[PDB]
């Protein structure tokens, strides 16, 4: 029993890392999205004037 809870604490801590990596990965991705959406507005407004 003293071995299986350490492997559970192992995989739980391993899950916590991958669960953290999930957040911070999509977190920077979200900033890339807002940035790419911003560049679209810089050109869309220019297009809207021509439109």
């Amino acid at each position: 029993l003293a071995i299986e809870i350490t492997t559970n604490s192992q995989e739980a801590a391993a899950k916590h890392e991958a669960q953290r990596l999930e957040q911070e990965a999509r977190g920077r991705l979200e900033r890339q999205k807002i940035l790419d959406q911003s560049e679209a507005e810089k050109a869309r407004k220019e297009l809207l004037e021509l439109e």
Partner: protein, 50 residues
């Protein structure tokens, strides 16, 4: 929001610019029409005055 601003103004003013531009044709037209109507009534009402 700058795209939202140029969207509303540029679109709505262009519609309001065309109707005013069309009204200018009626204004210049009505002047020439009333000027022609003057002759129409002048020759009508003066020649029939005899």
């Amino acid at each position: 929001a700058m795209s939202m601003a140029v969207e509303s103004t540029g679109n709505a003013k262009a519609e309001a610019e065309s109707r005013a531009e069309a009204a200018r044709i009626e204004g210049e037209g009505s002047v020439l029409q009333a000027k022609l109507k003057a002759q129409a009534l002048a020759i009508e009402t003066e020649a029939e005055l005899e």
